[PDB]
């Protein structure tokens, strides 16, 4: 009989005050949480944030919502949550978030005979994540998600992960175009402010970037042009037109790479690991052309010395460029 | 007993009139304010504004909400704020702001037995900031945030920082990848409009741009190419193909840097300090190509005069470029 169920629910909401937490003036109400990560949409270095979609469930017990005689879990309409008390949980490090509302508002209420309440939500949040791009594109990131109560201290509310380390699910199925999730952790602690001490729940991911792509697109073209500038050392110094044209075109080609990759690379201005490599290769092509000027100046009066300089330039330049790579990779890998 | 607490809260709001300010007709109500800054998301030179996320606490006293017999501070639900009087505080220079509302609206009401009301909000605002980009990228900005009462005058309401210089906390949390927080000040004053006078509170920061990025990407490539154009003076003047190709390719390379730099830097439609330097280098490479044309025109009939011009060019060109940098850097630093 659905008329009997209607009376039971209406009796619960009669005299129910939503301004008072359960066990007001008594022990703090324990709230358990768990998250199902639907997806991680985009990770942006420019804006220093990432987008997250998840199913956020909260668990708590309210003795004011205890019913008897109905051996069922009442899954009521989602509009009844506006007449109950719910925790004031907010995400401490989010820039913009919302609850999906198509076709109806994505919300769940599921009462239990003993007064327990299950409160589910579907949220798309854009949490902030500061990044250390010194080693870009060989960097490793650690983006977090902080969960905290807004108005109630530890004297009123408490947080814990429901199920221990198995609270968060779906992380293993997440695929990112540019990163790769390595590990995730769950942290529970208390945070002290001027007003008081607040419960805290933390979820963090460790992101490792994929370096294989950057080898072909970025590092390989710069290396080939640097090797191509060494061809001038194998041309006789009397061919002024050939060596100058080769020397200055590689410089022009090196600037084209720098001024066109920065458009593709994120526009966050400060020195990165890739910038030091491109500038390092820019010096070698610059010195290769500057070396010929020394030879072309003394080849008419000192042919023996000019030939000797070209012989040594065929060894010093390839050898020094190998030392530059060896120091670079060890310092960054 | 939760029933007793419900009676007290209902008694306070019974007959309460939200349309009348506290202590109506008497002394002005003092509203102490303190701000806890969360982060400064971004600073934009194109739109001349910065995005700020903060905790905005307001602290006044209303005798109508005084209660006795309850030795506790009533931390009520955030939905009770709609039934109380709150100041009409607004930010004068804000362009787009909102209160976070996931999972609930980030709002707080905490009453005290004497009638003191603590009212906190979590607000993300995009305040306008006039910028003087003449000295860009060596500039130093000063962005502000204006707090003012829209309706009431100085006789009705008063604003003051709660705690003096300790009112604003969390300045060290600001991590701008491009700027560096140098100083922040707190100002209290009065403002007169055509419709009356209003109290004013001001929070202002001072920002200094980081110059490390512009050295690698902008200044260094331009200096090396300008140096690379001096190689022409060390090549025998009968090698027309070598000196012309070197001279005209540096001009082409210099234009590539300038044209592909305005497409990456923020589009600031007036003259800055970075345009003067690039235009100065473009003149030097342009003059180095004119020098050879004069040499190429007179070397057949006056071999001595053409050779003399080449020797003096090896000294004058490097020397006058040093004066250009010495004047430029000292003026802008």
């Amino acid at each position: 009989n659905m008329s009997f169920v209607k009376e039971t629910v209406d009796k619960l909401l009669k005299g129910y005050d939503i301004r008072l937490r359960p066990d007001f003036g008594g022990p703090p109400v324990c709230v358990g949480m768990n998250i199902d990560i639907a997806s991680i949409d985009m990770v942006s270095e420019v804006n220093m944030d990432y987008t997250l979609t998840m199913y956020f469930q909260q668990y708590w017990r309210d003795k004011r919502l205890a019913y008897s005689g109905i051996p069922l879990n009442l899954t009521l309409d989602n509009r009844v949550a506006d007449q109950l008390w719910v925790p004031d949980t907010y995400f401490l490090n989010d820039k913009k978030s919302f609850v999906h509302g198509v076709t109806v508002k994505n919300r769940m209420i599921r009462l239990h005979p003993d007064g327990t309440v299950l409160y589910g939500l579907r949220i798309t949040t854009t949490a902030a994540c500061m990044m250390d791009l010194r080693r870009y594109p060989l960097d490793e990131q650690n983006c977090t998600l902080e969960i905290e109560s807004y108005g109630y201290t530890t004297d009123d509310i408490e947080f814990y992960w429901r199920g221990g380390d198995k609270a968060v699910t779906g992380v293993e199925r997440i695929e990112l175009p540019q990163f790769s999730i390595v590990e995730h952790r769950l942290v529970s602690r208390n945070v002290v402010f001027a007003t008081g001490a607040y419960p805290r729940l933390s979820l963090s991911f460790r992101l490792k970037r994929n370096i294989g792509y950057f080898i072909l697109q970025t590092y390989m073209p710069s290396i080939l042009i640097t090797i191509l500038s060494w061809v001038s050392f194998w041309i006789n110094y009397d061919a002024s037109a050939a060596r100058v044209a080769l020397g200055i075109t590689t410089v022009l080609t090196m600037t084209t790479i720098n001024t066109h990759l920065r458009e593709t690379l994120p526009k966050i201005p400060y020195v990165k690991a890739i910038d030091m490599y491109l500038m390092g290769c820019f010096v070698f092509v610059f010195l290769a052309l500057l070396e010929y000027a020394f030879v072309n100046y003394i080849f008419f009066s000192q042919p023996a010395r000019a030939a000797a300089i070209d012989r040594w330039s065929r060894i010093v330049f390839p050898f020094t460029f190998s030392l530059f790579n060896l120091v670079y990779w060890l310092y960054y890998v | 007993n939760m029933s007793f607490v419900k009676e007290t809260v209902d008694k306070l709001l019974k007959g309460y009139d939200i349309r009348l300010r506290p202590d109506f007709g008497g002394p002005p109500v003092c509203v102490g304010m303190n701000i806890d800054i969360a982060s400064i998301d971004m600073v934009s030179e194109v739109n001349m504004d910065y995005t700020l996320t903060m905790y905005f606490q307001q602290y006044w006293r209303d005798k109508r909400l005084a209660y006795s017999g309850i030795p506790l501070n009533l931390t009520l639900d955030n939905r009770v704020a709609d039934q109380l009087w709150v100041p009409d505080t607004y930010f004068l220079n804000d362009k787009k702001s909102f209160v976070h509302g996931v999972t609930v609206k980030n709002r707080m009401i905490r009453l005290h037995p004497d009638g003191t009301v603590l009212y906190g909000l979590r607000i993300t605002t995009t305040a306008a900031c006039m910028m003087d980009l003449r000295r860009y990228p060596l500039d130093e900005q000063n962005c502000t945030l204006e707090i003012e009462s829209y309706g009431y005058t100085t006789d009705d309401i008063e604003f003051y920082w709660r705690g003096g210089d300790k009112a604003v906390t969390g300045v060290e949390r600001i991590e701008l990848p491009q700027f560096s927080i140098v100083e922040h000040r707190l100002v209290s004053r009065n403002v007169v409009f055509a419709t009356g006078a209003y109290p004013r509170l001001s929070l202002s920061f001072r920002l200094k741009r980081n110059i490390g990025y512009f050295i690698l990407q902008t200044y260094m490539p331009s200096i090396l190419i300008t140096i690379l154009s001096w190689v022409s003076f060390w090549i025998n003047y009968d090698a027309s193909a070598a000196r012309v190709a070197l001279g005209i390719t540096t001009v082409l390379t210099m234009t590539t840097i300038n044209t592909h730099l305005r497409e990456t830097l923020p589009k600031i439609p007036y003259v800055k300090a970075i345009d003067m330097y690039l235009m100065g280098c473009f003149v030097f490479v342009f003059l180095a190509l004119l020098e050879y044309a004069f040499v190429n025109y007179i070397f057949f009939s006056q071999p001595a005069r053409a050779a003399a011009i080449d020797r003096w060019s090896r000294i004058v060109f490097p020397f006058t470029f040093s004066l250009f940098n010495l004047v430029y850097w000292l003026y802008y630093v």
Epitope: - | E172, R173, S180
Partner: nanobody, 105 residues
């Protein structure tokens, strides 16, 4: 008297360094804090204009320049690291990693 605090490891996840002193008869007291990158500093009221804090990222060191010392400043000085979203700055509980006790008289 110039105390220095040196850090290594994942120093980016803990961008704030703080100094605390523990009285023999009282509890830990806040002294000052320094951001690793920005350089902005905060000081306790009793030690304003007498102590100066600065840092360098060349070797990951935080400097505590002590001036106008007084006999009442006898306590064990600690160096601590605070997370990015650890909350308040004047409360020792929010700090995770605590350095070895150092005594200065």
């Amino acid at each position: 008297l110039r105390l220095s605090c040196a850090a290594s490891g994942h120093t980016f996840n803990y961008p704030i360094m703080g100094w605390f002193r523990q009285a023999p008869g009282k509890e830990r007291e806040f002294v000052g804090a320094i951001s690793w990158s920005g350089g902005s500093t905060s000081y306790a009221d009793s030690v304003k204009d007498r102590f100066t804090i600065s840092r360098d990222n060349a070797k990951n060191t935080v400097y505590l320049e002590m001036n106008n010392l007084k006999p009442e400043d006898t306590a064990v000085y600690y160096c601590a690291a605070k997370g990015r979203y650890s909350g308040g700055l004047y409360y020792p509980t929010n700090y995770d990693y605590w350095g070895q006790g150092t005594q200065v008289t």
